[PDB]
Amino acid sequence: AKWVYKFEEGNASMRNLLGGKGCNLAEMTILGMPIPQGFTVTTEACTEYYNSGKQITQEIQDQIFEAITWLEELNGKKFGDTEDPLLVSVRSGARASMPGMMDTILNLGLNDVAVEGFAKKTGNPRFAYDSYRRFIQMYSDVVMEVPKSHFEKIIDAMKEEKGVHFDTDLTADDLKELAEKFKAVYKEAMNGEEFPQEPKDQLMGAVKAVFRSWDNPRAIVYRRMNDIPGDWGTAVNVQTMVFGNKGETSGTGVAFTRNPSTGEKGIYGEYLINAQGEDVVAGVRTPQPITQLENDMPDCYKQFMDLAMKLEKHFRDMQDMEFTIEEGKLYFLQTRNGKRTAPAALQIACDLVDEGMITEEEAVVRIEAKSLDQLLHPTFNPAALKAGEVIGSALPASPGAAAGKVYFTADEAKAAHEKGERVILVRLETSPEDIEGMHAAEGILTVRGGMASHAAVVARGMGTCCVSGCGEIKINEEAKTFELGGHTFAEGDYISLDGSTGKIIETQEASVSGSFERIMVWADKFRTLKVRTNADTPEDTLNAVKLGAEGIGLCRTEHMFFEADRIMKIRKMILSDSVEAREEALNELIPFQKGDFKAMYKALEGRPMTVRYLDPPLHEFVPHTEEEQAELAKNMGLTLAEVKAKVDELHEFNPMMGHRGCRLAVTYPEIAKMQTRAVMEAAIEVKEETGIDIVPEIMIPLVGEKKELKFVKDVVVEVAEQVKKEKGSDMQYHIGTMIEIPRAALTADAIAEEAEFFSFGTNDLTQMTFGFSRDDAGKFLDSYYKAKIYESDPFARLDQTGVGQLVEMAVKKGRQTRPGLKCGICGEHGGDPSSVEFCHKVGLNYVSCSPFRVPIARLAAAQAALNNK
Amino acid sequence: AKWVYKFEEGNASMRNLLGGKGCNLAEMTILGMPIPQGFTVTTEACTEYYNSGKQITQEIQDQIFEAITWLEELNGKKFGDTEDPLLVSVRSGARASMPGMMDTILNLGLNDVAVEGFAKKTGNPRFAYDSYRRFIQMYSDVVMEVPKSHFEKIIDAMKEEKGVHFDTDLTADDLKELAEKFKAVYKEAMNGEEFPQEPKDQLMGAVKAVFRSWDNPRAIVYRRMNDIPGDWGTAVNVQTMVFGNKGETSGTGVAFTRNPSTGEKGIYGEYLINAQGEDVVAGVRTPQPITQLENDMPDCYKQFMDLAMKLEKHFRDMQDMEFTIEEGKLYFLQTRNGKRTAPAALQIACDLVDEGMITEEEAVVRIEAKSLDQLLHPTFNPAALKAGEVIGSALPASPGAAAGKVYFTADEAKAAHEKGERVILVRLETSPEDIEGMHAAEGILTVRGGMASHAAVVARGMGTCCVSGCGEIKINEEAKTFELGGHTFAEGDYISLDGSTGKIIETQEASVSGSFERIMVWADKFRTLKVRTNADTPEDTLNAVKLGAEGIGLCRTEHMFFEADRIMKIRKMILSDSVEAREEALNELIPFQKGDFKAMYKALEGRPMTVRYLDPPLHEFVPHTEEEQAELAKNMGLTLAEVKAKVDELHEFNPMMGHRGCRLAVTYPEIAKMQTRAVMEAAIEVKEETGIDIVPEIMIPLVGEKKELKFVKDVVVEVAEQVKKEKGSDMQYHIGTMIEIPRAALTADAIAEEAEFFSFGTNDLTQMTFGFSRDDAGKFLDSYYKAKIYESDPFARLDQTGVGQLVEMAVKKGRQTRPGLKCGICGEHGGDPSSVEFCHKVGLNYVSCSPFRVPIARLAAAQAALNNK
């Protein structure tokens, strides 16, 4: 039952039930706003249809065809009648706003005969035929039967072949004729199937389009990148059409209560007089500043602003709305918390707070965590921009200083590495088919669109740079080139930004609003999780410390063995055929490594740093180019063959799971012994030269058995304890381990006994758990997301149903035997908002992630706190 | 009566009465802290002595010599006795902390015989003689009889001529001998006067030094630059001496509760074991991190930190304190809100607020306004610092990226322009005698000092960069050169910063903490004054808008006549011998000027901009180089002689007071007519292309009579009104004027009738009021400050007792006839905290100042609000 709900039968509450626009539309209705009534097909009915072999069930249709009945009696007109036709619009809406992705159908109910009845009754035959020529084009695309170029090449060939310039200048005959020109295309571009004339067949067709599209490549790829599950689905909305294209006193526009890209307080949007935004606004015929609509229709503005402001105080957040003016009358067709850019995100958040509109928990909880990454994208370098050659200007859709090679298609722009080959995408406009390209490019450059245009919307959403409406861009696809300013380019390097200018540039790094801080302080007053960082170097430590890094969670020591002025000492150790010799070799490194931790400790100023012992296999440090192998045969008094014989002696079938980490530490204590001295001696000394207390945390990698950790810990304590002759050094320190091998988690209680702290190495723990090496996964990974087998990437987003059990088990079990057992997480998962919450809820003590994600971690940790209290 | 007060006889309340340290010392006593009792000579007694021909009155001495009595009976010892001598310290304290300037005397009461008694009784003859050799040196400097080099050249010649390295290694004989070596200098460097042996003569001498020094060049110059009046004066403190130089378990250190240069929370200071900070800490023998004093004397630290934290919660602000340890016992000798750098200023302010220690009005009121200028000093450019050649490192005394030519003396470093020739001062250490040099240099570079060293203190106070303790600097004065790293310099260009590094650099511009904002929001929630800016260009407008510029208060149009592609049209106007011709000429400029305001209006986005009409004389635009005059004789069909004849025809005796501004506008309406069109047409148009309402404000310069303003306003209204054919343009606009000519203020009521708004041009109003041209003043100005005739510069700091009456009169009178009369201020005075308050209190509506001082203005306006509610 109940597969369709009237707007008056619901509210914000049932957002899941009716979808996003669903509840909003229903909410606007419940308020008593001037909106065209309609009804909503439930997301559930999307499930039914899907869990029914993708067929629209009987009970469903009838219920759709019943609300349609309701509407007729509602405004005295029958659905797509022959004389007085009732036209409607169709538009999908998931529980998660997907701005730039969803679908919309206008004037549905029209056909060869009803248009004419619409012509007489309405009295404006140009209109009827315009509203019909439009609608045929949309049904052709949405209910995908054909591409837009087919249709626009025609109206355009028609205009640029009749001395006309805007469709707004075609006669009732031009259109009446055009319609057949489209009804001709849709058919000569399909089996030869007739175009739907039976409104009931047009409307049912619509719906399936929507329910169907919810599984097409683009959606799938879009949700995953927007952390949206696929078990939700879409809802479809049927509303009683209202027209901003009846003529000179009717319109339609998109507008935001506060600038969506800077937080700016005050109306931001565009519109066009006589037109149907749905397509006309998001495109050519340059839209007008919504703040001009006051000059032109200064009576509709008086009320459009009175509504928008109460819509914004209603939801107590900034609103992304849509209006159409019907010859003097104003109609709202949409409201929604405008998606934001990071800056605008915090900025508005602060305002709504100062303006009393909301509480701090609110704003803290509102910011989309992951987005703070934008905050840190390297802005341009002034001097580089001053000398910069600006060869054109256009709208500053989405902020940021983007710059890279240009590509006229998303297929090839992504081909050239993601945001790694520094790519740029130059197009006319963009569309749902360009999602991964816009996503993988430094910046998007379009030739027509405006604020309400796809690229902006979709770009200001992905915190990526975009410059739209740049007309002067003459693009060629057949030769893949474009003319901008005083130059012609060809897949070379171009540069753009929010200073709206495009040019022939050095980026640097930079500040953070006081609003970042203002919200960071708030996060910090609600978060229980502490936030350390993953830094192996002073500068990076410092950089993260500056973002609120409360210490270190993963200080890799590998490099201390790698780095040129230290590779030959580790290699000598491997070739040395005696423990006395290895011992020696190893000791040659203590000075350097010692230096290393000194610098980190002087830098950390009392801030805790979990030092992870040698992790990789010895094979990773020997030479694998006989050029280098023969080099090392002289720096060692040996022969190539024998050094090579050693190398080939260390070679493993699966490096990720062999004689490495803890296992090297057992076979070669010496190594672990040497690391304990360098760290101990270093800590003591700075503690000695600064007096600021240090409390080193040694961390044992790849542990999988209590006795395995003990053995190595027994080696550290003895060296650590010995080093204590620079004084018995009352200095404390804790031996701990990395819970990154399933057995470690399964036998935590047992592991807790020797270990003084658990540090979850989720990246590896996730490889042993999923059974696949990150390094060789991608070759199949994609097919998993495509096949929807995977909704998220485990390597960036902590698998909670699986890896999550191991993590929650180590903590539980680990604390049965050591109630205080401090716990942490490492790698990527530590910097992922979703993960950060799980950890908070499961039991961790702190979170560690790269230096630049500290803000993302803190906010997340913050939110996680408020959410689960 | 009452010229001296016991520490127990006062508290914080009477800060004016007892001076700064006065009340603090008295306050610490009232708390019950471990401090050496003493008494205080009132600031008033400084007045007496001064308003008594600079003689210490009789009633005064006795009262000093009476408290000294009190002290003997207080600790069973007589003042500088022969056997058990009571030694004391002398140190001045004004109601305004002058860190780095005031004076201090240790061990006063000692002499040839009492030292020996101090030797026996104490039992440590090295000590007695050390405490004596020190004290003789200080009395020699403070009670200025001789320079420090005289004394340090000796102890040093003595050490570097006896195989010794630190005075801490001279025997009881070395010192006993040294003393005579100093008592020998003081005398061979004076008439031949004996050195004071009578403690009563040493102590009275001290005091006069202090009261005297309060009028010496350096003080005078220091207060003015620190807005301190000279009618206040100093107070002198006499405290019962305690020693951190008795040996191995006694010490003395300087420390701050929170880092004075970053806001950092947590102890920051230095110290030295066995020594008397007063000189030893602020100098060589590298001090130790106060946080190490926990390793060495881990029992004194336990209590030093327990005290400092209650001293900080007591005053509810960060504390700058001084301690000495007397063989196990800890002694506090000072507390005081540590002077701060801008960043640290806001930062701590925010903390104390989050930590609940204080309310926001508090923090807002606490920040020293003027300091926010630091916030905006251009940091270095990363890439420029990455390629930068670091030829040495040292302590990061005061923040900032300083860089400029080096000068080994303050006398010559100031010679080469102030902070205009980009100067740098390289010295051993600095001192009160270097005040204007440190002040006029980009950055200070010293060879020995530390955190507690003069340059740091005095530098972190003036928000200027400083790198101290850089030993590797071998300086030569005789050849004015120094060796640093792998180079030797000679008055060339050097560079430094808070990254502590000094190097062989491009600076840029940059962010503002969220703490700047956090306090800016606060300012903004307490300020009633609005803050516009003085911008004549879009970029500058934008720049100021970014700091909270709520509009424009002074948009000069001169340049619109000046700029190359527009100078020839104004010149043609001047040479054209007909109003029809001039008219013509003028009209040629309307397009350009029109462009100009368009850009400003597109930039201002609705934000008000007071446009000031042509201000300078026509002579200012003709050529004054016959090379150019003969150039303009061909671009006009004339001869040199005749163009020259015109030029010489416009030449005035006093350009600042002739046929210019409003007077040109009367004689040549045309001009004013043309400005009204360019502005009107421009406003209408943007209002037309954006719909955002504009409300131009035309401002008439140099008005001095109602009928004078009317006449010109009558010309604007008619042109303004005419231009209203791009539509009657419902556009509003207000004619107003600049109250910058005394008569304007004296006849405001009369002026208010025609003018719709008053805009105080205080710079000029201050020249007509003081009667002297800023341009020719400096040649006598300095002698006014030196002669103390002027405490402040009127041109930067609004004369309130004078110019202030004219300002308060125009507002009063101006509102009798126009109750709404909006009012503003311009030029410098608008950006000066002191002025900004006066204006707030007198009646202005908003304040306008350069773009970068907007923060200074806002905070000031804020504070002014809280202060006078």
PDB file of C-alpha atoms in Angstrom, chain B residues 183 192 306 349 477 511 592 681 767:
ATOM      1  CA  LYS B 183      85.828  52.178  42.122  1.00  0.00           C
ATOM      2  CA  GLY B 192      87.527  62.686  40.859  1.00  0.00           C
ATOM      3  CA  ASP B 306      52.030  26.966  41.584  1.00  0.00           C
ATOM      4  CA  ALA B 349      42.759  36.764  24.808  1.00  0.00           C
ATOM      5  CA  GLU B 477      82.561  48.998  14.590  1.00  0.00           C
ATOM      6  CA  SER B 511      46.148  35.880   6.364  1.00  0.00           C
ATOM      7  CA  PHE B 592      37.086  57.685 -18.230  1.00  0.00           C
ATOM      8  CA  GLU B 681      25.606  58.090 -14.821  1.00  0.00           C
ATOM      9  CA  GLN B 767      46.626  72.735   9.698  1.00  0.00           C
TER      10      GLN B 767
END
